[PDB]
Design a protein around this ligand. Structure first.
Ligand SMILES: *[C@@H]1O[C@H](CO)[C@@H](O[C@@H]2O[C@H](CO)[C@@H](O[C@@H]3O[C@H](CO[C@H]4O[C@H](CO[C@H]5O[C@H](CO)[C@@H](O)[C@H](O)[C@@H]5O[C@H]5O[C@H](CO)[C@@H](O)[C@H](O)[C@@H]5O)[C@@H](O)[C@H](O[C@H]5O[C@H](CO)[C@@H](O)[C@H](O)[C@@H]5O[C@H]5O[C@H](CO)[C@@H](O)[C@H](O)[C@@H]5O)[C@@H]4O)[C@@H](O)[C@H](O[C@@H]4O[C@H](CO)[C@@H](O)[C@H](O)[C@@H]4O)[C@@H]3O)[C@H](O)[C@H]2NC(C)=O)[C@H](O)[C@H]1NC(C)=O
Ligand SMILES: *[C@@H]1O[C@H](CO)[C@@H](O[C@@H]2O[C@H](CO)[C@@H](O[C@@H]3O[C@H](CO[C@H]4O[C@H](CO[C@H]5O[C@H](CO)[C@@H](O)[C@H](O)[C@@H]5O)[C@@H](O)[C@H](O[C@H]5O[C@H](CO)[C@@H](O)[C@H](O)[C@@H]5O)[C@@H]4O)[C@@H](O)[C@H](O[C@H]4O[C@H](CO)[C@@H](O)[C@H](O)[C@@H]4O)[C@@H]3O)[C@H](O)[C@H]2NC(C)=O)[C@H](O)[C@H]1NC(C)=O
Ligand SMILES: *[C@@H]1O[C@H](CO)[C@@H](O[C@@H]2O[C@H](CO)[C@@H](O[C@@H]3O[C@H](CO[C@H]4O[C@H](CO)[C@@H](O)[C@H](O[C@H]5O[C@H](CO)[C@@H](O)[C@H](O)[C@@H]5O)[C@@H]4O)[C@@H](O)[C@H](O)[C@@H]3O)[C@H](O)[C@H]2NC(C)=O)[C@H](O)[C@H]1NC(C)=O
Ligand SMILES: *[C@@H]1O[C@H](CO)[C@@H](O[C@@H]2O[C@H](CO)[C@@H](O[C@@H]3O[C@H](CO)[C@@H](O)[C@H](O)[C@@H]3O)[C@H](O)[C@H]2NC(C)=O)[C@H](O)[C@H]1NC(C)=O
Ligand SMILES: *[C@@H]1O[C@H](CO)[C@@H](O[C@@H]2O[C@H](CO)[C@@H](O)[C@H](O)[C@H]2NC(C)=O)[C@H](O)[C@H]1NC(C)=O
Ligand SMILES: *[C@@H]1O[C@H](CO)[C@@H](O)[C@H](O)[C@H]1NC(C)=O
Ligand SMILES: *[C@@H]1O[C@H](CO)[C@@H](O)[C@H](O)[C@H]1NC(C)=O
Ligand code: NA
Ligand code: NA
Ligand code: NA
Length: 971
């Protein structure tokens, strides 16, 4: 419409006038605040065979101060866009304004709690509040569009605009979506708009009038977000209606799953992301992702492919620090999980199978395509008798762990065939799914059919190579049209049969851990078992430069096949040297199939490597791996300095500079006040981290109890003191976001002044998933209070959150990073704090009573260069009954962890190189808040590493780490 770079028809999207099956992975730039590491994520995504990445932009981080959009330094998106382009990955931009994403406010900055309008509606105040952010982010995205030589090809307006409740009846509001769309277009956005309906409801589909997007898309998370039972696949959870609904809701556009389950989030007191990785494992992928292909999906994005970390309080209360998500690429960026390797097999199948996009999805059947009803097959039939067809097979009961033998009865250019034709039966093992192919094209050679799955294929000059694989214990068969005979050119000929049947040469074989290569004419067919296929890679090879280029027919055709190990990032030909960039985590045998004619030498990670060439023209070599020594500090043995970070609990404390909580009104349109003045922190500009309230009053001697209702979000906690006397604490739980408590008080002297100090942990602002719920407006602070024997107005309040509130002090680390604790307000969490007069006490000694202390220490690192080494800070928790205490982890000023001993479940906190300095000094800081009478201390706290990966990744540049500087107006 507005451009010709990205177009579409009923079958697929076209990029540069060429059909492209778009297989994407979700990555959030703000969850990995290290520019140097973006290229790593993109290369790992490209290595899966993917060609696109989908990303959100978090408004709360870019306009923390209303009226001032700021996306510089670690918040700069340019390095993210540049890495995508460098890696040859396109982008789907999803700026919101509302993104949900399990982030604080669902993306909404805390000041939205002061906006007099229902969020995500046409209410004037809400729309106006989004204008500054929307115009700025759209302009930034506009410059990176493919129409301007950038990687961005699609744009998503809003996010899961799919439902309302609670009094708001304007949904769906055509003019609302049209407003977002018009504003983006006015900002320069010309690429197509794609939606992401929460479910297949057809909202904003083409033809629905105002607000309609260009390509209708929807989401799906079939296994849910509770990973407690990783091996349980509930009955009926596998969707079977996506194609039907698509033809009814948006038949004119390519079927698109903008968000398809790639893992799951986990709540405070949850089960841990390891279980989520186990639930959404390699079996889940092959069964559910191939099920998506059975619907003819042309755009598939997996949420998440890499989750990252909710550092600096950017996450919502419904989750904790980690956002590992159990995705293919872990929080520490590793790709050891089997799900990564399995996904690579499907990604590479899609990349070399144009026939799949033009095939017509049909209805599933338990009788038409096999000899047993225990199996279900969904056909994707070619346009004519000679066109390629695909058959997605699975157990009829998708959760079945049974092994079933069968025979495939499918239509082909040679008529209806019953396979195997040479005898025996095929096997579908537990929780597996396969895509059988017929009349599949391999550079002009017709593969009449293949039961074993296609990993990849290439034409190297006059030689053709096809890579097939089957799972353990399977018998397979394939046929090549017009072929006369075959020869086993590698491996034993045992179990391999070859016979000319009709106008095709049929070859039968049994899966083995040993590779067999069968030569059929000019075609070399590699016969592999799944686990061997896991080690193959298909890097693109550009003629000029080192960048692979985007994925298209041409770059796909000039790619090569490399058998290696942990990872193969890229390859390029420089003169007569074939360069391969890869990572290794063990001794790795190397094989290169299809080295360019001009290539004479093999260079791996810049090192000339000894290679030999075999009868099949395969280059072979080996890369040695020797685990290097990784010297890490013993945290317990470091020199620690500490300071009381609750000076408010002393009679000498002066809070005159604090904000007076004196508004006899609230700007929160969803919650009326129950106190004389507003005690909702957002009404005063405090939206993140620890919040403190101090209520001053003159006693009348009749006081006995102090009732109070606090609210800090799920898993929050609070602690109270009256002058220097401890009153009590609400240690919190995984199911409470607020708490009502009546505390008794010591006797007070009439005529004397007292102050009640209430410290409240803020776990972030809630999302607003259902429009009209206004859940994002759930306040943080004091909701109710009553001092017995006194009028509520007898107490005058002061409050504080992060120093300066919306006029936040750390422009480099963002509006959410630091909370309101004394040490944070002073900036003591930054490198080189003023510890000269501090005490020499460590967190291992801790506190012997309720309170909050801040700790500091430093240590130097000089880790092995040339290695990608994940570092984690681990807290011990071997005790049966957990002590009640909260910890905030600060590394070089960046908060990278909120630890709640009594709630969990996180004990291991990864921190990326870039935040940590691997060849310099590091400043570690911790706040320790004891919420029990016995006090609190750390029993075990260590810095550990996991497998050092021999890498080709460039040196990681340390991000800006502003050192401590005395702050004006601090208190
Ligand atoms: C360096 O990086 C690499 C990555 O690049 C890291 O390697 C990855 O490590 C992962 C662990 O962290 C690992 O995942 C676990 O795998 C467990 C093993 O099961 C799988 O493998 C079986 C075959 O073993 C061979 O391959 C694996 C690796 O794939 C290897 O570890 C073995 O040593 C062995 O290798 C040798 O053979 C291959 C060729 O075959 C050669 O290439 C090698 O050189 C060696 O010679 C395989 O049978 C199994 O599949 C069966 O079981 C799964 C379910 O577990 C089914 O889905 C599947 O259908 C199949 O079941 C059928 O067949 C069997 C056998 O006939 C039959 O009995 C059944 O009835 C059915 O018919 C797997 O692919 C796995 O147990 C484990 O799972 C965990 O535990 C339980 C399992 O009970 C599970 O429910 C949990 O969810 C949990 O995940 C993991 O999946 C990756 O596979 C591995 N990837 C690669 C590429 O190697 C490496 O660790 C890292 N190094 C360091 C130091 O960090
Ligand atoms: C370090 O290791 C330790 C273990 O050594 C580990 O501690 C465990 O952590 C888990 C996860 O956080 C704890 O399990 C959860 O506990 C939740 C809290 O339970 C208590 O509080 C509940 C809420 O009470 C308040 O609110 C309600 C409602 O507003 C109100 O009525 C109350 O008055 C109060 O204000 C309360 O409901 C609950 O009561 C049950 O248990 C008591 C005690 O037996 C019993 O007397 C009651 O009759 C009732 O049965 C209890 O007082 C809990 O809410 C939560 O349950 C939800 O989630 C689970 C899934 O996990 C669901 O199955 C369930 O249906 C709920 O939705 C869950 O049980 C666990 O208690 C800790 N273990 C111990 C021994 O302390 C740390 O997390 C680890 N730390 C790290 C860093 O990893
Ligand atoms: C701590 O104690 C408080 C109460 O002191 C608990 O909160 C109350 O919980 C009960 C039980 O769930 C709720 O009762 C329901 O009330 C429904 C009617 O709600 C309206 O009328 C209420 C009475 O005045 C009013 O409080 C409530 O306010 C809410 O909506 C307003 C409009 O959006 C908004 O301005 C307010 O801020 C607030 O969100 C409504 O106007 C009734 O239909 C149900 O049958 C049931 O009786 C109370 O409504 C809750 N009170 C409030 C103010 O929310 C709280 O759960 C306790 N905490 C814990 C952990 O137990
Ligand atoms: C790759 O990154 C992931 C995610 O950061 C790392 O996974 C974590 O690995 C540890 C160590 O294996 C797991 O903890 C262990 O759990 C078992 C089972 O309870 C327990 O017996 C051990 O004592 C230990 O606690 C942890 O659960 C897991 N976390 C997640 C989120 O999956 C993995 O270690 C990294 N791999 C490499 C090589 O870097
Ligand atoms: C409770 O704490 C308050 C501080 O908020 C004390 O009042 C202050 O006391 C200091 C020291 O005498 C004076 O310099 C301040 O001017 C006082 N401020 C106020 C608001 O009165 C108060 O004395 C303490 N109460 C008791 C009995 O210890
Ligand atoms: C061949 O198979 C198709 C589909 O399985 C079936 O409809 C047809 O009757 C069979 N015979 C013909 C006409 O080729
Ligand atoms: C907050 O409320 C006050 C008093 O009603 C009003 O003057 C002010 O404009 C409001 N702020 C916003 C953001 O609406
Ligand atoms: Na080629
Ligand atoms: Na424990
Ligand atoms: Na735990």
């Amino acid at each position: 419409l507005l451009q010709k770079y990205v177009t579409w028809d009923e079958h697929s999207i076209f990029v540069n006038g060429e059909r492209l099956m778009i297989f994407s992975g979700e990555v959030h730039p703000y969850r990995l605040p290290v520019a140097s590491l973006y290229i790593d994520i993109f290369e790992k995504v490209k290595a899966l065979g993917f060609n696109c990445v989908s990303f959100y932009v978090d408004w709360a981080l870019l306009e923390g101060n209303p009226g001032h959009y700021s996306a510089e330094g670690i918040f700069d998106l340019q390095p993210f866009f540049d890495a995508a382009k460098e890696a040859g990955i396109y982008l789907l931009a999803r700026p919101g304004p509302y993104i949900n994403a399990e982030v604080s406010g669902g993306g909404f900055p805390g000041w939205l709690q002061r906006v007099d309008g229902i969020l995500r509606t046409s209410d004037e105040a809400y729309l106006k509040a989004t204008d500054n952010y929307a115009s700025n982010i759209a302009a930034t995205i506009a410059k990176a569009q493919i129409t301007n030589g950038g990687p961005i090809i699609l744009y998503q307006p809003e996010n899961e605009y799919s439902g309302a409740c609670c009094g708001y009846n304007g949904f769906p509001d055509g003019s609302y979506m049209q407003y977002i769309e018009d504003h983006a277009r006015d900002a320069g956005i010309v690429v197509p708009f794609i939606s992401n309906d929460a479910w297949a409801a057809g909202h904003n589909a083409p033809g629905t009038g105002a607000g309609a997007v260009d390509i209708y898309g929807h989401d799906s998370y079939p296994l849910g977000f509770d990973c407690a039972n990783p091996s349980t696949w509930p009955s009926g959870n596998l969707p079977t209606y996506f194609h039907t609904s698509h033809e009814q809701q948006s038949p004119s556009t390519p079927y698109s799953l903008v968000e398809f389950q790639g893992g799951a989030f986990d709540p405070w007191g949850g089960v841990g992301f390891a279980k989520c990785a186990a639930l959404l494992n390699h079996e889940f992928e092959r069964v559910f992702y191939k099920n998506d292909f059975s619907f003819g999906v042309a755009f598939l994005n997996l949420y998440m492919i890499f989750g990252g970390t909710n550092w600096g309080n950017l996450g919502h209360p419904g989750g904790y620090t980690s956002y590992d998500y159990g995705s293919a690429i872990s929080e520490s960026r590793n790709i050891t999980r089997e799900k990564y390797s399995e996904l690579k097999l499907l990604g590479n199948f899609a990349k070399v199978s144009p026939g799949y996009l033009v095939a017509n999805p049909g209805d599933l059947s338990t009788s038409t395509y096999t000899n047993t009803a225990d199996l279900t097959v969904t056909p994707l039939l070619g346009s004519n008798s000679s066109a390629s067809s695909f058959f997605v097979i699975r157990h009829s009961d998708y959760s079945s762990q049974a092994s079933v033998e069968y025979k495939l009865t499918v239509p082909t250019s040679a008529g209806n065939l019953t396979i195997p034709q040479l005898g025996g039966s095929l096997t579908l093992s537990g929780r597996d799914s396969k895509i059988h192919v017929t009349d599949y094209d391999v550079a002009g050679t017709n593969i009449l059919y293949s039961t074993a799955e296609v990993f990849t294929w290439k034409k190297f000059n006059n030689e053709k190579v096809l890579v097939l694989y089957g799972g353990p214990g399977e018998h397979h068969e394939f046929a090549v049209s017009g072929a006369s005979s075959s020869s086993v050119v590698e491996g034993s000929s045992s179990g391999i049969s070859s016979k000319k049947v009709g106008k095709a040469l049929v070859v039968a074989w049994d899966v083995s851990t040993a590779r067999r290569i069968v030569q059929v004419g000019s075609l070399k067919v590699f016969l592999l078992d799944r686990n061997s296929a896991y080690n193959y890679w298909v890097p693109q090879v550009p003629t000029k430069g080192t960048a692979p280029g985007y994925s298209n027919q041409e770059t796909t055709a000039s790619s090569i096949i490399v058998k290696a190990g942990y990872l193969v990032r890229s390859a390029y030909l420089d003169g007569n040297d074939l360069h391969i960039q890869a990572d290794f985590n063990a001794t790795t045998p190397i094989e290169v199939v299809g080295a360019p004619s001009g290539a004479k030498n093999l260079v791996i990670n810049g090192k000339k490597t000894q290679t030999k060439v075999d009868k099949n023209g395969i280059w072979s070599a080996s890369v040695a791996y020797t685990a290097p020594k990784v010297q890490l500090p013993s945290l317990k043995s470091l020199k620690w300095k500490s300071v009381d970070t609750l000076p408010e609990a002393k009679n000498t404390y002066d809070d005159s500079a604090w904000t007076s909580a004196d508004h006899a009104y609230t700007n929160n349109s969803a919650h009326s006040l129950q106190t004389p003045t507003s005690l909702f922190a957002s009404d005063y500009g405090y939206h993140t981290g620890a919040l403190l309230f101090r209520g001053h009053f003159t006693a009348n001697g009749k006081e006995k109890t102090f009732f109070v209702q606090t609210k800090g979000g799920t898993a929050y906690g609070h602690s109270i003191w009256i002058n220097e006397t401890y009153v009590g604490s609400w240690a919190g739980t995984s199911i409470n976001d607020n708490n009502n408590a009546t505390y008794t008080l010591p006797t007070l002297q009439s005529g004397k002044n007292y102050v009640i100090t209430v410290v409240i942990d803020n776990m972030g602002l809630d999302e607003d998933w259902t429009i009209g719920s206004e859940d994002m407006k759930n306040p943080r602070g004091i909701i109710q209070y009553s001092l017995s024997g006194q009028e509520a107005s007898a107490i005058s309040w002061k409050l504080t959150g992060n120093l300066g509130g919306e006029n936040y002090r750390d422009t480099v680390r963002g509006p959410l990073n630091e909370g309101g604790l004394y040490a944070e307000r002073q900036g003591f969490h930054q490198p080189q704090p003023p510890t000269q007069k501090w005490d020499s006490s460590s967190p291992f000694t801790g506190l012997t009573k309720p309170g909050i202390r801040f700790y500091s220490t430093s240590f130097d690192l000089d880790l092995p260069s040339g290695y990608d080494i994940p570092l984690y800070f681990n807290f011990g928790n071997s005790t049966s009954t957990p002590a009640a205490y909260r910890v905030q982890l600060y590394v070089n000023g960046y908060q990278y962890g909120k630890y709640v001993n009594n709630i969990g479940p996180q004990t291991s906190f990864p921190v990326p190189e870039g935040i940590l300095n691997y060849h310099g000094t590091n400043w570690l800081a911790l706040s320790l808040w004891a919420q029990e009478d016995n006090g609190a201390k750390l029993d075990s706290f260590e810095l550990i590493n996991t497998t050092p990966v021999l890498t080709s990744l460039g040196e990681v540049k340390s991000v800006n780490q502003p050192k401590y500087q005395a702050r004006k107006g601090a208190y």
